Every structure is written in C-alpha cells, then in structure tokens.
C-alpha cells in the first residue's frame, strides 16, 4: 500500500 | 554494601574442603556471595553421613520463623530440608522425583525379567 503522494498547488497569492 | 533492591534469603553456604561438602544455613541478602556476608546463621547441614550413618541438620526454628516473618525468601534446597524435617509440606519436586524414580525402577524390573525368562 503506497502512501499518498504529497502535492501542493499555490493559487491564493498570484 | 547497599545493593539495588534485593531481599533476604535463607540459603546454604558451602564450607569444608574439597570433596567434603558442608552447608551452613544462613540468612543473607540475595545479591551477596554464597560464602560472603550474612545477617544471621540459622543452622547447619552436613550431607555426608557420619559414623552412625546419619545426616545432621540443625534448624534454629525460633530464628527461622522470625526471618520468614520478616520477608526472607527460601532457596529451593532449603525448602526441601524443611519438608524433610516436617516444618514445611513436602516440596512437589520431592514428590514428583519420587514418582519418577518409581517409574524408572519399574521399567528396570521388566527388562530384568525378560532377560532371565527368554534367556
């Protein structure tokens, strides 16, 4: 069971 | 010397010389050496039969009852000496070993009978 891949997307501050 | 934890134990301290065992019943700390410091000697035990064919055991019962009531434990051989004396009930190992010895000799009788009868 592979752990979830941490993905971060920044859109709050342009 | 103040050991970490530990307790008093009534055990046998071996004395005498080589091939001449002799045990002194003492009340000493658990962590102390076998023949080291003891609080109070509570008797003696001579495993070798004397000229009368007897094994002499000395039991300072008044002091033995005192130390047992103070929390002193008993070694397994000491619990058998008390059982032999009748101070304590017979230890289960003494009874169990007696049963095993009877079984061992019972099988020896069957082997002896077969040798004589068959041959």
């Amino acid at each position: 069971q592979p752990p979830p891949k941490p993905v971060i997307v920044d859109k709050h501050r342009p | 010397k103040a050991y970490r934890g530990g307790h008093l134990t009534i055990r046998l301290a071996l004395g005498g010389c080589t091939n001449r065992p002799f045990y002194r019943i003492v009340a000493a700390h658990n962590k102390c050496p076998r023949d080291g410091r003891f609080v109070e000697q509570l008797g003696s035990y001579d495993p070798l039969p004397n000229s009368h064919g007897e094994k002499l055991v000395a039991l300072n019962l008044d002091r033995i009852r005192h130390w047992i009531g103070c929390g002193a434990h008993l070694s397994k051989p000491m619990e058998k000496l008390l059982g032999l004396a009748g101070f304590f009930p017979l230890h289960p190992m003494m009874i169990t070993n007696a049963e095993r010895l009877r079984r061992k000799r019972a099988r020896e009788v069957l082997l002896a009978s077969q040798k004589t009868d068959a041959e």
């Binding site: - | 049963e99 095993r100 009877r102 079984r103 000799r105 019972a106 020896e108 009788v109 002896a112 004589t116």
Partner: protein, 32 residues
Amino acid sequence: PPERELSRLRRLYQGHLQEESGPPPESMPKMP
C-alpha cells in the same frame, strides 16, 4: 487428571508431547 484437561495440554503443546504417564507404582520396586 480429567480427560478434557489432558487434551487441553496436548493442544497447547502440539509437536512437543511425551508419552502420557499413568499412576506411579504404590511401592518402590527392587532388583531381583
């Protein structure tokens, strides 16, 4: 010991059991 208790020990110690022993002789045998 009861039969059920003996079976419980056999299940508890599978593969490491000795021959069951009956009651010991009432008296100590001697060599003829």
